Structure formats: structure tokens, C-alpha cells
Symmetry: C3
Subunit: 240 residues, 3 copies
């Protein structure tokens, strides 16, 4: 009731703070290399801040079949989570075609998760399993193609990737658990407590995640986005 | 959905599920190799088609809109799979990337305008069918001109692979307006159950059958197609 | 209204005429380079023509909370307006990553404007201010990185960009003013005159804007789309932070 709107505000204020920070740093290096990382970090927080305002105002919260569905989360995630995987893919030096495949799996994961959030007690679990299935394929890529590519970059880029990869995996693994423990699955935790965990995860997965990216230095991010080094990484990754 | 409709929604589902395992196995086996995009594109095409077919089995994307029951999950399926099919065919033909995007934009326009007719009145569903068919002819033109005029300029065994897939695509895609205009969206001359039979047979042919011929071309061939 | 239906037809006819013109010039520039410009201009007018037809038939005009919302405009704008900024981005020689940022902010502008169009009198203004904020940042980029990159390019191309930029700026400024003075905000102007303004703005911003693009020489258009002349304006722009 009141706990839901309070923690919806905590998420919205957390997103806005990241917007000011990422937006300032992104426009401070508009002519530089590595600009795409604070730029992507800014749009991820911007899209999340808007959608969090849609839920605060109740614009994207709707009862479908007896359950109050916060469907604005899926409008958020279907855009922000592919951008996060793309941002991590550029740092890892992964081939863009494999990045597009991982982003495609992410869209499938979010869309099927939305179907489960709108489904009945029998079928909300079925779509949860299918979405989790694509989630494991994403986790497999983050530990295989992502890690094998980044290992072939300089030590500081591979160091930044592994930190961001571990941050991503630890945070994202909690999302389906919050989903299944909330109103979409087993109504064992309250909606307010579910709103609490989602906002804490969202701020960590977007603002805290983006902070680690921009805190790597202008030289690091410029090297991670450099075309010569990326094509060098993709080539070396393919010869094994 | 009725008994025949539900039966043929399952045939399309199983067809896409089978294609997923084949294309998915081949895709992750060519991960560090060239030509990987073709088994991967074929996998995502069958994967997105499989999920949408499941939504229609469960009636999640089956709804009455203006009296009629509209299977709007098909247009969620088509607006994604058909642009990917033309893009995969555009890379095999060695087409310029800017005109691949243009052909894909014309394809999205075709699916969207076709969806408007699916939910419209018998006066205006035929009007949008003609608009949708108009862009379909422009795509058939590009398939017979720019697609063929760029595959000629490439390796002789790639050009043969293109002409096979393209002629498969053209003959298959031509029946879709026929079923639509003869189905519930146009003149209801065939039943919804019989209409779903045609869509299931066509979808499995144009996705798993089409995708099979692509991956059945050899690894050194698909590597040359992606360079 | 009778006036809205009339001016919905004017916009629809204006978009169709633009389709015939740009489609003819596109199919006459097949294996030439610079083909993307009349083809981009053609798709912009085609998407707008189809969406204007959906509004004529009332398919995309619906009472949402009881206010008549022409939500087909936002289905149109969320597609055509990012293409216009992208097409202008290629002419200006702007780096593609910054083009994507402007395009993303443009989609943000249309989406938040659609939310305001369907919301109550308290919060329709709040989303109007949010959308106008991203509009100001886009105008900032048009005067900043767009102009700084086209300045270092050919004299014929920089002249074309500035003409298109001034045309875009002047036309796009009127949209939030029509919006806030129309049914979406304070209902100061009627639905009929609001339909007039949107039709007049849309035709000029798509048919007239694209006309200036295609009415440039095939020399200028081929040079504006060149891969390595776009790599050189990017290399010079990215290294001249002086
Ligand atoms: C910033 C928001 C983020 C990073 C959201 C991430 C969300 C997920 C990783 C959601 C995953 C889901 C599953 C794995 C299956 C069931 C439903 C979802 C959507 C909770
Ligand atoms: C795998 C699914 C495929 C390949 C579907 C293809 C569908 C079409 C080519 C549909 C075309 C239509 C028209 C040309 C006009 C009227 C309506 C449609 C959607 C049947
Ligand atoms: C061809 C159609 C065009 C160029 C439409 C342009 C529309 C805009 C620049 C709209 C801007 C808006 C704001 C700046 C804030 C409030 C709402 C909008 C959508 C009117
Ligand atoms: C490139 C590797 C990640 C993309 C592949 C997408 C696979 C999605 C897995 C679907 C699993 C379905 C569970 C039944
Ligand atoms: C009435 C619902 C029952 C559906 C049964 C479907 C059986 C599928 C037959 C085998 C399909 C094989 C496709 C290649
Ligand atoms: C496929 C290459 C681009 C061709 C342009 C596609 C647009 C066709 C629209 C036709 C509409 C016809 C209405 C009667
Ligand atoms: C490279 C293009 C710049 C993109 C920045 C987008 C800015 C959005 C501003 C939103 C402000 C919200 C109003 C308070
Ligand atoms: C019975 C629940 C209805 C499910 C709607 C599914 C929407 C899928 C959007 C692609
Ligand atoms: C009253 C209008 C009938 C509904 C038509 C819906 C068309 C949607 C086009 C996207
Ligand atoms: C630069 C701060 C942007 C804040 C966005 C507010 C929610 C759309
Ligand atoms: C080895 C680094 C792990 C980082 C995970 C932190 C998530 C809060
Ligand atoms: C009704 C109180 C729910 C408490 C849930 C706590 C989950 C960590
Ligand atoms: C760069 C040429 C692309 C024109 C078509 C735009 C995609 C809808
Ligand atoms: C590869 C498994 C397909 C599942 C369809 C929902
Ligand atoms: C190049 C990344 C910017 C994308 C914004 C949607
Ligand atoms: C009801 C307004 C929400 C729109 C989300 C795109």
C-alpha cells in the first residue's frame, strides 16, 4: 500500500540521480572515445526513471485477471537490459553478431516474463520456466563467449569486464526469485517487499553498474570502444 | 479455438520446436566460425515463432476485436520473423546493408497494414489488404531485381543457394494473401479451422523448411556467404 | 468536426504526393550513391500517409478517458522523426553513435508526449514538460555536434545541412505549442484548427523537408553519404576539441 509507493519513489530518485551523473559525464566527453558508455548509462537510467514515474502515477499499473500487474517494469526491462548486455559486450570485445544474439535472447526473456506476469496460476509458472530457460542461455554466454573474448584484451579491460560481469550475474539472478516469491508467483512476500527488492536491484543494476563503468577512466573506456582493439579481439577469439 | 484450429496450432508449435533444437545445436557449434549468423538467425526465427504459437494455443494472443476472433499473435510473429528472413536472405545474396533495411521496412509495413485489415470491418479490411498487397509486390520486385542482381556478382555456389531459397520464399509467401483474403479476415469462404491448417503448413515450410536449406549448404559455403 | 476530416485528408494527400515524388526519385537513383536520401524521404512519407489514413477511418482516433486522442500521430512520429534526425545526421557527417543518442532522445520525446496525451489535466502538463526537456536537448545537439561536424565538411554539404537544420528547428518548435494549446493541454484552439496545424506542419516537415534534400544535386547527395568522407569528418571532429 504505502510501502509500494515509497519504494517506487526510492527507485525513481535513484534513477534520476544516475541520470544527472551519467548525463553530465556523457556530455563532457561528446568528442572523445569511450563516450558511448556514459551515454548508454544515461539512457538506461533515463528510460528506467520515466517508467518508474509511470508506475508512481499508476499509468502502467493495471489489474488484469485479479492481480495488480506492474507491466511498466517490462516496458523498462525490454529496453534497458538489452542495452546493458550490449554495453558489456563492447567492453568484452565480443563480435557484434554474437552481441545481437544475446540481446535477442534478452528480449525473449523479458517478453515471456511479461506473459507470465499477465497469466493464470497454472500458466504463469510455465512462462516463468521458458523465460528462465533463455536466462540460462544468457548466463552461459556471459561465462563463455563474453569471458573468452575479454580474456584476449589488455589486463585492465578484462579486469573491468569481470567486475561488471560478476555484478550483473549476482544482481540479475535475484530478479526471477523476486518474481516467483511475489504476486506473479507464490504470494509469499508482500507487494511492498517485492517493490523494495526490485528497486534495490534496479538501482544497483543500473546506477551502481554504470558507476563502475565510468569510474574506469577515460583511457580505459576509449580502449574498450576502440575499433582496432575490438577487431583484434574478435579475430583472436575466432582462432581457437 | 475449435478442435481443428487447436490441432493445427499444435502442429505449427511442434514444427517450430523441432527446428529450434536443430538450428540451436548448429548455432552454438559454429560460434567461433564464420557463417554463424545463418544457424543463429534461423534459430531465433523458429524460437519467436514457437513462443507465439504457444500463446495462440493458450489463447493469450487470440481475442475478439470487432465481433470476429482475431489471431493477432500471428502479426506479432510475422513482424519479427519475416524481416529477419529477408535480412538473412539479403546477407546470403550479398545485398547492400542500406537496402536490406529498406526491404525490411517495407516488410514491417506489409505486416502492420495487414494487421489493420485483420481487425477492420468488411468494407475496410479489403482496402488494407490491397495496401498490404501493394508493398508485397514491391518486395517481390526487390527479390527479383536487387536481390538477384547482387547474388549474381558473388561465388557461383552462393548464387545457386540464393536462387533456391528465394524461389522457395516467393512461392510460399504468395499463398499468405490468398489464405488471408479467403479466410475470416476477408471473404469467409474457408473456415477458421481450415485457415489455420494453411498457416501452419506455410509457417513450418517458410521457417524450418527454409532454414534447413540454409544450414544444409555446408560450413565453408555459409562462411563465404557472411564475409 | 468536418474541419478535422477535411484537414486529415489534406495531410494524407500531402503525404501521398510526397510518396510519388520521392519514390520516383529513389527508383531513378538505384545504383547511384546518395540513394538512401530519397528512399528515406519516401518511407517517411509512406509511414505518415498510412497513419493519416488510419486517422481518417477513425482507426487510430479513440476516446481514451473520454478525450478524443489522435494516438495515431505518435505511432507516426515515433518512426518518422527519428528517421529525419538520422537522415540529417548522415548529411552533417555526425558520428553514428551520437546519431543514435539523438534518435533515442527523439523516441523518448514522442513516448513521453504520448503519455501526456492520454493523461488527466494535472499530469498531462508534467509529461509535456518532460518531453519538451528532451526536445531542448535535441535542439542543443542540432546547434552543437550537428553543426560542428557539418562545418568541417564540404561547403555545398554544410550549406544543405544548415538549411535543413533551420527548417527542422522552426517547424518542430511549433509542435509543443500546438500540443499545449490544443486538446492535449489547455483547449484554447479547437480540434479542427489543431488538425490544420498538425497537417500543415507535418507536410512541410516531411514533404518540404525531403524536397530540399532531394532538390540538392546528385553530386552533393552522393558526397554526403560517402563512407570515408563521413569517416573524415568524424576523425576531424573527434580530434579538434582544441
Ligand atoms: C535494470 C533491470 C534489470 C537488470 C532487470 C533484470 C530482469 C531480469 C533478469 C528478469 C528475469 C526474469 C526471469 C529470468 C524469468 C521470470 C521473469 C523475469 C522477467 C523476472
Ligand atoms: C513465417 C511466416 C511468413 C513467412 C509470413 C509471411 C506473410 C506474408 C507474406 C503476408 C502477406 C500479407 C499480404 C501480402 C497482404 C494481406 C495480409 C498478409 C499479412 C497475408
Ligand atoms: C513529421 C512530424 C514531426 C516532425 C513531429 C514533430 C513533433 C515534435 C517535435 C513534438 C514535440 C513535443 C514536445 C516537444 C513536447 C510535448 C509533446 C510533443 C509530442 C508535441
Ligand atoms: C547467443 C546465445 C544466447 C542467445 C540464444 C537464445 C536462446 C534462448 C533459449 C530459449 C530456451 C527456452 C527454454 C525452454
Ligand atoms: C486437439 C489438440 C491436439 C493436438 C495434437 C497435435 C499432434 C501433432 C502431430 C505431429 C506434428 C508434427 C509436426 C512436424
Ligand atoms: C522493397 C523495396 C522498397 C519498396 C518500397 C516499399 C513501399 C511499397 C508501398 C506500396 C503501397 C501500395 C498502396 C496501393
Ligand atoms: C546525444 C543526444 C542527447 C540525448 C540526451 C537526452 C536528454 C533528455 C532530457 C530529459 C529531461 C527531462 C525533463 C526534466
Ligand atoms: C489470458 C492472459 C492474456 C495474455 C496476453 C499475452 C500478451 C502477449 C503480448 C505479446
Ligand atoms: C473503431 C476503429 C476500429 C479499430 C481499428 C484498430 C486499428 C489499429 C491500427 C493499429
Ligand atoms: C537529466 C535528468 C532527467 C530526469 C528524467 C525525469 C524522468 C523522465
Ligand atoms: C567478484 C566481484 C563480485 C561483485 C558482486 C557484487 C554484487 C553486489
Ligand atoms: C508481510 C511481510 C512480508 C515480509 C517479507 C520479507 C521478505 C524478505
Ligand atoms: C539508409 C536507407 C534506409 C532507408 C529505409 C529506412 C528503413 C525504414
Ligand atoms: C528451444 C525451446 C523452444 C521453446 C518455445 C517456447
Ligand atoms: C550508441 C548508444 C546510444 C543508444 C541510445 C538509445
Ligand atoms: C498509459 C500510458 C503508458 C504508456 C506506456 C508506453
Amino acid at each position: 500500500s504505502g510501502m509500494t509507493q515509497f519504494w517506487l519513489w526510492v527507485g525513481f530518485i535513484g534513477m534520476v540521480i544516475g541520470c544527472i551523473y551519467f548525463g553530465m559525464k556523457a556530455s563532457a566527453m561528446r568528442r572523445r572515445e569511450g563516450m558511448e558508455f556514459p551515454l548508454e548509462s544515461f539512457f538506461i537510467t533515463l528510460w528506467a526513471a520515466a517508467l518508474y514515474l509511470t508506475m508512481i502515477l499508476g499509468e502502467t499499473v493495471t489489474p488484469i485477471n485479479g492481480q495488480t500487474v506492474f507491466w511498466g517494469r517490462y516496458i523498462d526491462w525490454v529496453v534497458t537490459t538489452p542495452l546493458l548486455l550490449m554495453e558489456l559486450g563492447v567492453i568484452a570485445g565480443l563480435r557484434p553478431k554474437l552481441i545481437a544474439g544475446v540481446m535477442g535472447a534478452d528480449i525473449f526473456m523479458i517478453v515471456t516474463g511479461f506473459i507470465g506476469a499477465v497469466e493464470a496460476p497454472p500458466y504463469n509458472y510455465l512462462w516463468w520456466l521458458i523465460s528462465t530457460g533463455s536466462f540460462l542461455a544468457i548466463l552461459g554466454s556471459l561465462l563463455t563467449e563474453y569471458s573468452a573474448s575479454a580474456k584476449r584484451r589488455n589486463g585492465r579491460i578484462n579486469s573491468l569486464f569481470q567486475t561488471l560481469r560478476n555484478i550483473l550475474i549476482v544482481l540479475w539472478i535475484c530478479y526471477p526469485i523476486v518474481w516467483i516469491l511475489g504476486a506473479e508467483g507464490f504470494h509469499v512476500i508482500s507487494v511492498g517487499w517485492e517493490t523494495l527488492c526490485y528497486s534495490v536491484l534496479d538501482v544497483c543494476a543500473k546506477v551502481g553498474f554504470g558507476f563502475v563503468v565510468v569510474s574506469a577512466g577515460n583511457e580505459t573506456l576509449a580502449q574498450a570502444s576502440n575499433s582496432d582493439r575490438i577487431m583484434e579481439t574478435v579475430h583472436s577469439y575466432m582462432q581457437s
